[PDB]
Design a protein around this ligand. Structure first.
Ligand SMILES: CN(CC(=O)O)C(=O)c1ccc(F)cc1
Lengths: 412, 412
């Protein structure tokens, strides 16, 4: 019989701060983490701004010797994980290490390191490729390195489902616990795609906002004048724990994870369907999994990428799933402030949805100056909204028509 | 309590063949798929050979237009997937499309595409990066394209667990069906890394055999003269199906997937512990999941990569799990013939484990001329061994200490 799963620890790096509370204070103040990128010369690029992690000190977590071997996305995922585990108060023992696993994912993983080693190969030759090229760049090594540093011998894996990765990672980790394959999982995602290939690759697809003039105003989900997503870096990690296990050790419980939905659009490799049919199927799957009436949903943390087709598809999916109740819930895109952390987006947004439950506040959609046609829901324009939230939903949609929905509720 | 999961379709590209029966004929003949890599200047590389897919015709599967947009590893995964679905005879309908999903993964993903776009970026700047660079290179696009092409609306995701990916993808797909999240899944893995960054990256770590003078003898698991693994390309895919679903439509059933195990070594980034303690836990977990005693195992498809430390760790793990029955089971490494398909290794080896059951024959470990110290099990040296096989395991042990075991049984 299926066990209940609760959130006992959370950890983050985002464009708004180097931990959860600093990121969350920025979210509730309506602060933007988007700025011109300083780490490289981007005059040749149509987009020259993004959400960078500012002032990250990897030596808060790892020796300089080890850090040098690891792509930033792995450094970011370990930081978030180490925070989440510390925040949980869990002690790893011989009695429990086989029951604790990790599922930290990434959309693209070690693209900076792969580019750097590619430049070495092309300019010099294969003799100049780093010996750490593979273990320092491949996506499964957040889970790998985290298990090595903390002694976690439970299920050890990584998802890579593009912009859905962090939501899927958290959902399937919950399934592991629910079905008895583990008692604790560290789950979420990490991303640092801000290199020549990532900025150039998304730019070649004309997927990014090109508002270089006002980087902080570029991410404007459901605004009439949106022109694509803002590329952002960082990590989110959550400690998921079986309810009785958490109760038994006197753990602080943030919220319960009650529902998870997946669906494939089977529509298009990059475009969502205009009517959000895939998103609707996924949200209904998640609400049925949670045993809910759709009217119980109080807050939705939207995918809300600031893409013309993506944003309107989500309105359509929410109206389809919730009917008249769509006008009573609050829905916001924290990507208005953070930009789009890709494989990490679902991980930081899960955390923001849990904090919305803790603090009974809907985060704003900043930059929502002129809501587009049919975008007439409560999208929490401009300013945080204190309100009752018993049930919070976090949505992600990705390339390949992959959808994920997590349902969290307050724990009594 | 859980639904039963059977194999109804299989698909493959390997260094031995462009399908399952050609590959399996090569396996039972002890044929090698390893040869000097062509159409590439490997003068400056310490390893000049590997397991290429020979004569792949992508236009049997995709238009020229679609093929040009996708990395070889995505082409290979879709080829295996289409083969597997065709082999299953399954008919996708509006009635069943929400119950059919995909979990096709990769260890390292789009290195060829990343190389080619790096060349464009370094030589001409970012304006020459392909618009399709991102969707055409990310690991989840086998699941994505397959779901779009066949109209699959079930769970759509992709794992990336380095050399464990294929084993994990199949096991987790089996869980989706067992726990009623899907009735059908296409699962496995694909890889094309016997390319510049793959050979250069693994060669920098001195992980590869450098036996350039005798490429067919380089992969020699448990042989005293082994000097590292052989890099290989290809794909494997299985149609996994709920038993009553398969019976109702009169599907041909190859075997039953009865057990799945996962563990973490929590030991080292690339090397297993000398005693294979993590591999032991994983095999135990898989047998307990199947409700089977170690005495019931007849055949193990080893991970058996031809690394010094990895091969001996597996011997220690199997002696620990199976005690005196370790000498009565048969264990072989088909990597002696195929080399190491990394993320696809567990997919093609799951298929060889299924065909070991179908045909009642243990594939050989070729090149096992002088078994090393402690390597005194029935390693099916040199020649295929007809024998009774009721229960077959397939092991994968990957970077980050991530372990997977599948347990297959004859169906009746
Ligand atoms: C180079 N090192 C570090 C070390 O020996 O200490 C590795 O572990 C290693 C890296 C990649 C690989 F394919 C195999 C091995």
């Amino acid at each position: 019989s299926r066990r209940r799963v609760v959130i006992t620890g959370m950890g983050m790096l985002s464009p708004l701060g180097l931990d959860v509370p600093s990121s969350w204070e920025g979210i509730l103040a309506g602060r933007s983490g988007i700025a011109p990128i300083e780490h490289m010369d981007l005059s040749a690029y149509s987009t020259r701004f993004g959400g960078s992690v500012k002032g990250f000190n990897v030596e808060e977590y790892l020796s300089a010797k080890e850090a040098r071997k690891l792509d930033l996305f792995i450094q970011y995922g370990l930081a978030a994980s180490f925070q989440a585990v510390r925040d949980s108060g869990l002690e790893v023992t011989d009695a429990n290490r086989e029951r604790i696993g990790v599922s930290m994912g990434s959309g693209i993983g070690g693209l900076t390191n792969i580019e750097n080693n590619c430049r070495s190969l092309f300019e010099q030759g294969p003799r100049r490729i780093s010996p750490f090229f593979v273990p320092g760049s491949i996506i499964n090594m957040v889970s790998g390195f985290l298990s090595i540093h903390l002694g976690l011998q439970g299920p050890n894996y990584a998802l890579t489902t593009a912009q859905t990765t962090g939501t899927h990672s958290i959902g399937m980790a919950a399934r592991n616990i629910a079905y008895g394959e583990a008692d604790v999982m560290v789950a979420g995602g990490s991303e640092m795609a801000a290199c020549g290939l990532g900025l150039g690759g998304f730019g070649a697809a004309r997927a990014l906002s090109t508002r270089n003039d006002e980087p902080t105003r570029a991410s404007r989900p459901w605004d009439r004048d949106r022109d694509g997503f803002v590329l952002s870096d960082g990590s989110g990690a959550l400690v998921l724990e079986e309810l009785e296990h958490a109760r038994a050790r006197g753990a602080r419980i943030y919220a319960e994870l009650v529902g998870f939905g997946m669906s494939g659009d089977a529509f298009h490799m990059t475009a969502p369907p205009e009517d959000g049919a895939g998103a609707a199927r996924c949200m209904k799957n998640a609400l049925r999994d949670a045993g809910l009436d759709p009217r119980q949903v109080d807050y939705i943390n939207a995918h809300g990428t600031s893409t013309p087709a993506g944003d309107i598809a989500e309105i359509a999916a929410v109206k389809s799933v919730f009917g008249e109740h769509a006008h009573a819930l609050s829905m916001s895109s924290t990507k208005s402030m953070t930009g789009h952390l890709l494989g990490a987006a679902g991980a930081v947004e899960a955390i923001f949805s849990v904090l919305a439950l803790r603090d009974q506040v809907a985060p704003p959609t900043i930059n929502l100056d002129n809501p587009d046609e049919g975008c007439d829901l409560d999208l929490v324009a401009h300013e945080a909204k204190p309100r009752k939230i018993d049930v919070a939903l976090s949505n992600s949609f990705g390339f390949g028509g992959t959808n994920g929905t997590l349902v969290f509720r307050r724990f009594a």
